[PDB]
Amino acid sequence: ARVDQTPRSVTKETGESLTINCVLRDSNCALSSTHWYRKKSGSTNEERILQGRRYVETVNSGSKSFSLRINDLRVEDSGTYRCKVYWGNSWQDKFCPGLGSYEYGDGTAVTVNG
């Protein structure tokens, strides 16, 4: 019932790669999907992380584990990334949230030095 997103902070020089992880802890409920959002440093609106050459989104469904990997880091990627997990319809279970219920991760502040 909690999205544990790690790391909370990361700083890397321009060129290398990084990976953001967020997993659901202590859950018996089906998950439908998970989206990734980025709020650039200085903005207040989030952008959906769509298809990208340098973006890789990985899902381990049975693990309730979701990861985002960004290769060839640039300063344009500096900001805060959040994962947004969506719940599926877990049949015959009162304690599970309905289909479409969501929870955001705590967030990840990433800094890329030029």
Binding site: A1, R2, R8, Y37, N45, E46, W87, N89, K94, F95, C96, P97, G98, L99, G100, S101, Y102, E103, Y104, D106, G107
Partner: protein, 195 residues
């Protein structure tokens, strides 16, 4: 009819401490839920007994809007079957819960530099809170064997405890405003409908 006044609950200038949580009845209005659901301002949007994607197609005999302030580490407790200091002593959802739990980070509003200690929560109670019950009393909790004549001291604690909300806190100790909508469907004409 007219739209339900969700704003006067979500956008209230001041929120209450979880032990004195607020409750406003929503009645005789059209309820637009996808405005809340399709938003980027809410950290948690979990509905129970009903999918949020179907809320605008359903009517209800009565809708209650409950609002309070807790810390992020305790948002998990606002859910059916959960236990903890808040669920047991402050705000308890029933196991047969049908409704939605909506929460968002309110660090910019409810945190002061040097700490905001104005939001309280009940730390001690004799028995666990019944579902949707609210406890207002401030009587000294009889902790140990020796009774208490309204005096705070040894084995005599004040039942309420303050949060320390500071901007420099981790997200687990940052303040979260929570709105829980509880839906009731009886064999009677429904008062709240979606479009």
């Amino acid at each position: 009819t007219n739209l339900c006044p969700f704003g006067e609950v979500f956008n209230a200038t001041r929120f209450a401490s979880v032990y004195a949580w607020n409750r406003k009845r929503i009645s005789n209005c059209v309820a637009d839920y996808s405005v809340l659901y399709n938003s980027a301002s809410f950290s948690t949007f979990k509905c129970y007994g009903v999918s949020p994607t179907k809320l605008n197609d359903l009517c209800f005999t009565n809708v209650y809007a409950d609002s309070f302030v807790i810390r992020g580490d305790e948002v998990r407790q606002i859910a059916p079957g959960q236990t903890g200091k808040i669920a047991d002593y402050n705000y308890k959802l029933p196991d047969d819960f049908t409704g939605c739990v909506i929460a968002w980070n309110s660090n910019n509003l409810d945190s002061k530099v040097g700490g905001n200690y104005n939001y309280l929560y009940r730390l001690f109670r004799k028995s666990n809170l019944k579902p949707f019950e609210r406890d207002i009393s401030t009587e000294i909790y009889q902790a140990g064997s020796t009774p208490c004549n309204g005096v705070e001291g040894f084995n005599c604690y004040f039942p309420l405890q303050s949060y320390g909300f500071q901007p420099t806190n981790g997200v687990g100790y940052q303040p979260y405003r929570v709105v829980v909508l509880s839906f009731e469907l009886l064999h009677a004409p429904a008062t709240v409908c979606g479009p």
